[PDB]
Every structure is written in C-alpha cells, then in structure tokens.
Design a protein around this ligand. Structure first.
Ligand SMILES: OC[C@H]1O[C@@H](O[C@H]2[C@H](O)[C@H](O)[C@H](O[C@H]3[C@H](O)[C@H](O)[C@H](O[C@H]4[C@H](O)[C@H](O)[C@H](O[C@H]5[C@H](O)[C@H](O)[C@H](O[C@H]6[C@H](O)[C@H](O)[C@H](O[C@H]7[C@H](O)[C@H](O)[C@H](O)O[C@@H]7CO)O[C@@H]6CO)O[C@@H]5CO)O[C@@H]4CO)O[C@@H]3CO)O[C@@H]2CO)[C@@H](O)[C@@H](O)[C@@H]1O
Ligand SMILES: [Ca+2]
Ligand SMILES: [Ca+2]
Length: 302
C-alpha cells in the first residue's frame, strides 16, 4: 500500500498514518516570481499548500515542466501538495469559466509529471467549478470528470469542490456526495467545502461539517476566509475550532497577492508581515502553528 488514500472517512498516508491538512492556498499561476512562498509557508508551520494552477482556458496554462517544478519544490519544503485548476471558477455565471472536462484533459496531460508522486500530490479537479445558476447541474459533469480521470489511470487522491462558487449554499454537493464518491472506483476522493460569508454562524459551520462526518464521507475546508465581505462576516473562529474538533483538514485563502488584499495572510509576500487575518490563521487558537503536524512520509527532520 502506497500513496495518499482514503479509508474510514480519513485521509491516510501510504503508511496508514492519519493526515490532517493545516495549510494555505498560494496563487502560483499569477505569481511565478514568488518562488520563496512555499518555504515561507512551511516555516510558519503549514503541512500542506494548495497550489493555484491554470489549465489555460481563462488564464495562462501551467505546463508540465512548471508543474513538475512545483511538485518538487513542495517536496523540498516537506509540504503535501494540493494542485487545483482555477479556470473552472463560477461556471454558468462567470462568462470566462472553463469546464470540468477541459480541466480533466489538462490533468491527463500532466500524468507523466504526476507519476510517482501519489505520496505527495492530491488532484483538485477544478476550483469552485459552478456558480449560483442551476447548481444541480454540477453533479453530472463532476461525476463524469472523476470517471474520466480514473479511466485514464490517474491514481492520486482526488479532491472535489462544490457549486455555488464552492460554498454549496443550495446544498447540492452535500445532497449528492454519496453518488459522487461512488463514481470513484478507488474510493480515494475527498470533498472540499469553501467557507466564506455563507458560513457566518457557528451552527451553519458545525452542521455542514458534521453532515459529511456523520455520513462517513471525507471532507476538507479547501479554502476559507475570515474578514467580512459584501455578503457578510465569515465565522473563521468556528471554522478553525470545528475543524480541530472533528480533525478535518483546512487550507486558508490565501498567502498573498489578492487583487483586494483583504484576504492576504502575508502582506506583499513577506512572511514577517502578517495581516490580522494571517496572524489569526498562523498564530491564533486552533491555527496552523498550534495544530499542524508534518506529513510522516517526510520522516523525522535531522
Ligand atoms: O493584470 C496583470 C496582473 O495580473 C495579476 O494576476 C491577477 C489574475 O489575472 C486574476 O485577475 C486574479 O484574480 C483573483 C483574485 O486576485 C483573488 O485571488 C480571487 O480569489 C478568490 C478565490 O477563488 C476564493 O476561493 C474565493 O472565491 C470567491 C469568488 O471570487 C467570488 O467572490 C464568489 O462570490 C459568490 C459567493 O460565493 C456567494 O455564492 C454569493 O452568493 C450570494 C448570492 O449572490 C446572493 O446574494 C444570496 O442572497 O446570498 C448568497 C450567499 O452570500 O455570490 C457570490 C457571487 O456573486 O465567492 C467565491 C467563494 O465562494 O474568493 C477569493 C476572492 O475573490 O480569485 C481571482 C480570480 O478568480 O488576481 C491576480 C492578482 O491581481 C498578476 O499576475 C500581476 O503580476 C499582473 O501584473
Ligand atoms: Ca449564513
Ligand atoms: Ca470574520
């Protein structure tokens, strides 16, 4: 038995040890020059980074050599690597958005560089791959993309984002999760909820996470916020506490470089200059410094 995989609703390393993501998102595709971000993120205690890629539909395609380099750099910094295609974001509502099938073709094109990296790399098929229009339409192409990647021979653990821009507020991923999970013959599939202003009360967070846990289905919070936006105030204190209580993975949005800097954890990619949001995530109660454990595949650091 090798590779990251799912068993009993838990993400396990090849050696069977439970792995709970404690990390952040890094916007690699828009910031190719910010090479030190991965080392900086590791130094602040993260055990996982979610790396923003483009499949070229909307932004500039990250080619195989670039992706190979990203994977190697994650391994060099003793980080588990969640790769994700951002171009799918908001499909049906964002005009520029790409399809999950287009993302799937891109992943298949990367299989030579993904090969042998199942201990380190999780494939998040497409970011937030449906908007708020007809979110029930998300299920069929998500299932099709899962089946297509498995048919192509991809063995990595998969990660699945929800419609309603990843916040699933109409409950489609929650309702249809069992059918999506069953589309993966290997069972190595994670669901990912994104929590922004929909998740502005503790009960919304607890009930959502517990719905997956109580169903036996694996869930991570693959992107989440904290500072208020135009739709409300995300309750990040409950996100962090509930994720620790249930020992579910989380990945804060984002290291640095947002067009609106309100969600930058670090200001200007400087790890010593954390925003209030960055301080909360890295140094606060139930945060990364407190609760992140390195993946055991890397061994005991000298
Ligand atoms: O130009 C040269 C320059 O380029 C630079 O690169 C730039 C890139 O080209 C690109 O423009 C990039 O843009 C980024 C941006 O910087 C951010 O990083 C952004 O991060 C997102 C991320 O995806 C998060 O996961 C999350 O995603 C958000 C969406 O962004 C969006 O806000 C959406 O909103 C939903 C919401 O989720 C909810 O459903 C709500 O429902 C409402 C509903 O509308 C009703 O009101 C109802 O009553 O209530 C419900 C419930 O509230 O609807 C809204 C939609 O209307 O939410 C999702 C999460 O759910 O947020 C992050 C912040 O947005 O991604 C962008 C790309 O997608 O920026 C680059 C930097 O500028 C560099 O290369 C530079 O060097 C170069 O010079
Ligand atoms: Ca709410
Ligand atoms: Ca908040």
């Amino acid at each position: 038995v090798t590779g990251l995989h799912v068993q009993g609703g838990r993400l396990l390393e090849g050696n069977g040890n439970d792995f709970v993501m404690r990390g952040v998102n890094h916007a690699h595709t828009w910031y190719p020059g910010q090479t030190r971000s991965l080392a900086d993120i590791k130094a602040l205690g993260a055990n996982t980074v979610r790396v923003v890629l483009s499949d070229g539909h909307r932004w500039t395609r990250n080619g195989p050599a670039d992706v190979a380099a990203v994977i190697d750099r994650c391994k060099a910094n003793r980080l588990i690597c969640v790769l994700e295609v951002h171009d799918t974001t908001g499909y049906g509502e964002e005009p520029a958005a790409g399809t999950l099938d287009h993302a799937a073709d891109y992943w298949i094109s990367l299989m030579d560089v993904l090969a042998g990296q199942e201990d380190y790399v999780i494939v998040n098929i497409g970011n937030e791959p449906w908007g708020n229009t007809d979110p029930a339409g998300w299920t069929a192409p998500t299932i099709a993309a899962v089946k297509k990647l498995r048919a192509a021979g991809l063995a990595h653990t998969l990660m699945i984002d929800a419609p309603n821009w990843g916040q699933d507020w109409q409950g489609v991923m929650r309702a249809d999760a069992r059918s999506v999970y069953e589309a993966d013959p290997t069972g190595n599939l994670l669901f990912s909820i994104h929590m922004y202003s929909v998740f502005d009360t503790a009960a919304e967070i607890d009930d959502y996470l517990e719905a997956f846990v109580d169903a036996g289905l694996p869930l991570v919070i693959g992107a989440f916020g904290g500072p208020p936006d135009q739709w409300g105030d995300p309750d990040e204190d409950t996100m962090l506490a509930a994720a620790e209580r249930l020992r579910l993975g989380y990945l804060a949005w984002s290291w640095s470089g947002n067009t609106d800097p309100v969600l930058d954890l670090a200001i200007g990619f400087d790890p010593d200059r954390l925003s209030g949001w960055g301080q909360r995530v890295f140094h606060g109660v139930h945060g990364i410094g407190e609760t992140s454990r390195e993946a055991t595949v890397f061994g005991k650091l000298a």
